[PDB]
Every structure is written in structure tokens, then in C-alpha cells.
From a paper:
We chose the KLK6-selective T11V/G17R and T11S/G17R double-mutant variants, and their corresponding single-mutant selectivity-switch variants T11V, T11S, and G17R. The amino acid substitution that most increased the total selectivity of APPI-3M toward KLK6 was T11V/G17R, followed by G17R and finally, T11S/G17R. The individual substitutions T11V and T11S did not improve the selectivity toward KLK6, rather they somewhat decreased it. These results suggest that residues 11 and 17 are correlated-selectivity residues, which act together to increase target selectivity. For example, we found that the mutations T11V and G17R, when combined, yield a highly potent and selective inhibitor for KLK6, while combining the mutations T11S and G17R yield only a moderately potent and partially selective inhibitor for KLK6. To gain insight into the structural basis of the observed selectivity changes, we attempted to crystallize the APPI-3M-T11V/G17R variant in complex with the increased-selectivity target KLK6 and the reduced-selectivity target mesotrypsin. A structural analysis of this complex revealed that a deleterious steric interaction between the APPI Arg-17 mutation and mesotrypsin Arg-193 pushes Arg-193 into a more buried conformation, as previously found in the structures of mesotrypsin bound to wild-type APPI or BPTI Kunitz-type inhibitors. The steric clash and the restriction of Arg-193 to a single buried conformation can explain the reduction in affinity toward mesotrypsin, which is consistent with our prior structure and mutagenesis studies.
To test our approach in a real-life context, we chose to map the binding selectivity landscape of a broad-spectrum trypsin inhibitor, namely, the human amyloid protein precursor inhibitor (APPI; a member of the human Kunitz-domain family of serine protease inhibitors), to each of the four human serine proteases—kallikrein-6 (KLK6), mesotrypsin, anionic trypsin, and cationic trypsin—all of which share high-sequence homology and structural similarity. APPI has attracted our interest as a scaffold for engineering selective serine protease inhibitors due to the marked sequence diversity among Kunitz family members, which possess canonical binding loops that are highly tolerant to substitution or incorporation of additional amino acids. Because the sequence of the canonical binding loop and neighboring residues largely determine the affinity and selectivity of the inhibitor to its targets, using APPI as a scaffold offers a unique opportunity to optimize target affinity and selectivity without compromising stability. We chose the serine protease family as an ideal group of targets to demonstrate our strategy mainly because inhibiting the human serine proteases is of clinical value: both KLK6 and mesotrypsin are involved in cancer progression, while anionic and cationic trypsins are involved in the etiology of pancreatitis.
Author numbering:
A (entry chain E): 2 to 57
B (entry chain A): 16 to 34, 37 to 67, 69 to 125, 127 to 130, 132 to 184, 184A, 185 to 188, 188A, ...
The structure:
């Protein structure tokens, strides 16, 4: 319910998906490389879905 | 590919990449109209490129074909990564020649200790990220599926086996997934997962293609 403070996680799998995570310390979303599998819920398809769920 | 080396042009005519905007996975051309990759590379809309060597410096001879069907294994499991294999049917059959060509399906399971070639345009570093443009290659042995489950307790299934070095420093990495591992001239596995890239006591886990030659063959006949 408060995953926005969880780190950006690539996970075990090895694709390169371009995803977005909320960077708690700069108050905005940033991109990270996501393996395609596993990880955490601080992971979203658009910079806009990310800000709508954890923006300030 | 971490610790590997740059392939020579043409030497992997079966190595194929998947795209939707950017390069997100590798693949294997197994028949004029079919490609084999991993199931966690699924995307509703994929463009398959063939014959590539430098991803951002092309010559006239590559081939761009949009996937017209993407079939993931019915028994794929997103959490455990079970049966992490998938097929792609190309909207137009590939032109087979000196730089685009097929790979034989595996006629026997992968013998532990056997040397294999693993390739792909994946990240070159274990700390940080450096995604290369020129196709990379790595020569690695199959390991005993007893050390494989020692490395990853409770997480191996009948579909997976390990390739690489237990010392670390050499492995496949993000963007390699779905790419081929070829042993004694046939396709023995699809790169799948791993804890980190080329870390100590964490080699790459790959998908046992031999366990799927029956399913891969029925799928091509029920979509032809």
C-alpha cells in the first residue's frame, strides 16, 4: 500500500524492459531496467502511472 | 554477455533479436517462419530482426519482420519461471542465406560438462550497465544439475539447467534473455534467469529446449 519507497528491482530474469519507479529522494519518477519477472510493485509502465500512484 | 567476446560477423546466422521500440530480448531462428525465445519476453506486439550484427550501425542485409503470433508455453508460471519458453511466427518467411539461417532442434538432452555457445546483445557489466552494439559470444560448460540446484536451492524445475562458471565473471545478462545456447551444433537452451550477472556461485539458468521438441512441433502444425 506503500511500495513507492521500495527500491527499483531488475529481478532474476534477463530481458531489458524500460519501466519506471518512483525515486523517493528526488520526488519524481525515474526509469530503470526491469528483467521482465519478479521485482516489487514500485514498477510501472508509464512515467504517468507512476506519478499518479506515488506523486507528491 | 559478461566476460565474453565479440562474435565475428555472420558466425551466428540464427541469432535474432526481438523489438518494440527498443531491443528487449534475443531469439533463435528455428524454421523459415518460426523463432524460439523465453516466455518472459512476451509482448503483445513484437518486431523480430534477423541477421543483425551491430544493432545501431546497420548494413543493407538485415531483415525486419513483425511477429504475427506469439505463443507462450501453456504451463508457463510467472513466479517460479517454470517452462520459460515461447515461440514467435513471423508474418513473412525469412530469406535464408549466408547471414540469416536456422538452427537444428536438440536431438538429446544437454550433457553435463558439455561446452556451449551463448550469445546476445546483453549487458557487459556485473556492476552497472553497458549494453553493447556488437553481438557478443561466450563459451561455457554445462554444469551438473546437482550444482545448479545447490546454487539456487528449491528453485530448479524439470525445465531448467545451468551453464557458466561457478567462480563468476562470465554469464549472460539483461537483454540476453531468450537468446540461444547452442551445444555441438544444436539448440539446447534459452537464456532465462539468474541472481545478478556473472556473480560468484550464481551462474545463468536456461530453459531445457529438449523437453519441448514435441510441443514446439505440435504448435507449428496447429498454426500453419
Amino acid at each position: 500500500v506503500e511500495v513507492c519507497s521500495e527500491q527499483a528491482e531488475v529481478g532474476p530474469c534477463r530481458a531489458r524492459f524500460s519501466r519506471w519507479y518512483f525515486d523517493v529522494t528526488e520526488g519524481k519518477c525515474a526509469p530503470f531496467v526491469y528483467g521482465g519477472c519478479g521485482g516489487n510493485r514500485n514498477n510501472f509502465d508509464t512515467e504517468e502511472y507512476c506519478m499518479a500512484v506515488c506523486g507528491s | 554477455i559478461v566476460g565474453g567476446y565479440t562474435c565475428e560477423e555472420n558466425s551466428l546466422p540464427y541469432q535474432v533479436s526481438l523489438n518494440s521500440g527498443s531491443h528487449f530480448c534475443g531469439g533463435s531462428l528455428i524454421s523459415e517462419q518460426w523463432v524460439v525465445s523465453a516466455a518472459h519476453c512476451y509482448k503483445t506486439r513484437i518486431q523480430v530482426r534477423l541477421g543483425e550484427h551491430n544493432i545501431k550501425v546497420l548494413e543493407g542485409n538485415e531483415q525486419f519482420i513483425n511477429a504475427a503470433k506469439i505463443i507462450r508455453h501453456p504451463k508457463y508460471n510467472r513466479d517460479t519461471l517454470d517452462n520459460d519458453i515461447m515461440l514467435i511466427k513471423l508474418s513473412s518467411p525469412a530469406v535464408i542465406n549466408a547471414r540469416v539461417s536456422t538452427i537444428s532442434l536438440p536431438t538429446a538432452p544437454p550433457a553435463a560438462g558439455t561446452e556451449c555457445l551463448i550469445s546476445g546483445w546483453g549487458n557487459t557489466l556485473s556492476f552497472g550497465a553497458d549494453y553493447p552494439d556488437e553481438l557478443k559470444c561466450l563459451d561455457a560448460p554445462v554444469l551438473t544439475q546437482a550444482e545448479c540446484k545447490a546454487s539456487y536451492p528449491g528453485k530448479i524445475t524439470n525445465s531448467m539447467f545451468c551453464v557458466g562458471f561457478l567462480e563468476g565473471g562470465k554469464d549472460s545478462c539483461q537483454r540476453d534473455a531468450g537468446g540461444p545456447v547452442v551445444c555441438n551444433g544444436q539448440l539446447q537452451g534459452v537464456v532465462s534467469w539468474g541472481h545478478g550477472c556473472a556473480w560468484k556461485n550464481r551462474p545463468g539458468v536456461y530453459t531445457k529446449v529438449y523437453n519441448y521438441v514435441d510441443w514446439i512441433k505440435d504448435t507449428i502444425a496447429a498454426n500453419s
